[PDB]
């Protein structure tokens, strides 16, 4: 008994909580943004987009989202938002959306 490398599990747990939290913010803000854009809120719909974009790229900093997982999210988000805005949109803040 006592294969002191229990520590690994010990740590795994923390990390889990850390990651788990990181992604909720991502999702939350993403909807937050998509939902806005949807009902054409341009200016603020993008404002939130950006925060989201950031959190995402940030998760990829460490081993949270990491890689293309981050890339995906970003495009799927920007796509949804830019498209959703085509409801009289006119992307004010131009936030992350390339002019």
Partner RNA sequence: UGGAGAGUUUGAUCCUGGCUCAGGGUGAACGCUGGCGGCGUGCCUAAGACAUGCAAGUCGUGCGGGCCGCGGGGUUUUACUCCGUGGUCAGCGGCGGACGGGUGAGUAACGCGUGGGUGACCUACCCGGAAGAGGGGGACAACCCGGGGAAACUCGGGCUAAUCCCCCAUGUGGACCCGCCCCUUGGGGUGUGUCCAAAGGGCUUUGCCCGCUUCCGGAUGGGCCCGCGUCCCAUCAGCUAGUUGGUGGGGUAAUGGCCCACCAAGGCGACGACGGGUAGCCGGUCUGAGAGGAUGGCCGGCCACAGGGGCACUGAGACACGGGCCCCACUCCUACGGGAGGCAGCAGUUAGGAAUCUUCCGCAAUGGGCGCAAGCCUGACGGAGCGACGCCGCUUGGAGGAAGAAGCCCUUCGGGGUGUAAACUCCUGAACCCGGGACGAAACCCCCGACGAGGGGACUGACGGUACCGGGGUAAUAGCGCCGGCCAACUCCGUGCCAGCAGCCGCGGUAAUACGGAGGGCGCGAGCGUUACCCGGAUUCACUGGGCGUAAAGGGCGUGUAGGCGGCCUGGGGCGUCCCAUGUGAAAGACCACGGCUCAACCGUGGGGGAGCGUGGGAUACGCUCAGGCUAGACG
The closest of 48, 39, 31, 52 to 84, measured between CA atoms, is 39
User: Token pair for residue 18?
Assistant: 């850390």
Instruction: State which residue, 4 or 90, has the beta carbon closest to RNA.
Output: 4
Alpha carbon distance 95, 32 (integer Å) = 15
Per-residue binding string, RNA, 16-55, x by CB under 7 A, is x-xxx-----------------------------x--xx-
For residue 58, the minimal CB distance to RNA (Å) is: 5
Q: Whole-angstrom distance between the N-terminal and C-terminal Cα of the chain? A: 63
Footprint on this chain of RNA (rule: CB under 7 A):
1, 3-16, 18-20, 50, 53-54, 56-58, 60-64, 66-72, 74-76, 78-80, 82, 94-99
């Amino acid at each position: 008994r006592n294969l002191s490398a229990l520590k690994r599990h010990r740590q795994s747990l923390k990390r889990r909580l850390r990651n788990k939290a990181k992604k909720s913010a991502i999702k939350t803000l993403s909807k937050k943004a998509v939902q806005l854009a949807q009902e054409g809120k341009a200016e603020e719909a993008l404002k939130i987009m950006r925060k989201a974009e950031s959190l995402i790229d940030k998760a990829a900093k460490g081993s949270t989202l990491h890689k293309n997982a981050a890339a995906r999210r970003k495009s799927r988000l920007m796509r949804k938002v830019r498209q959703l805005l085509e409801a009289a949109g006119a992307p004010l803040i131009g936030g992350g959306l390339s002019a």
